[PDB]
A paper describes a structure:
To resolve this issue, we obtained 1.87 Å data on a new crystal form (tail-FHA only, lacking the GGDEF domain) comprised of residues 1–135 of DgcB. In this new form, four FHA domains comprise the asymmetric unit, with each monomer arranged at ~90˚ to the neighboring domain. Upon imposing crystal symmetry, it is apparent that each monomer contacts a symmetry-related molecule in precisely the same manner as chains A and B of the full-length DgcB structure (mediated through D56). Hence it can be inferred that the FHA:FHA contacts in full-length DgcB are not dictated by constraints imposed by the GGDEF domain. For one of the FHA domains, difference density was observable at the putative phosphopeptide-binding cleft (next to consensus residues S75, R76 and T96). Our high resolution data allowed us to unambiguously model this density as residues K13-S19 of the previously disordered N-terminal tail of DgcB. It was not possible to assign the tail as originating from a specific chain (chain B, C and D FHA domains are all close enough to span the distance to the bound tail). In agreement with assignment of the FHA domain as a putative phosphothreonine receptor, the interactions between the tail and FHA cleft centre around residue T14, which is conserved in homologues of DgcB. The FHA cleft makes three hydrogen bonds to the tail (involving R61, T96 and N97), which binds in a linear conformation across the apical face of the FHA fold. Aligning the N-terminal tail from a representative group of DgcB homologues reveals a pattern of conservation across a seven residue span (−3 to +3 with respect to the central threonine); our structure underlines the importance of the +3 position (V17), which points downward into the cleft and is a crucial recognition feature of the peptide substrate in other FHA-based sensory systems.
Numbering used by the authors: 13 to 19
The structure:
Amino acid sequence: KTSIVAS
């Protein structure tokens, strides 16, 4: 699965 970026 794809990482979630920092927001």
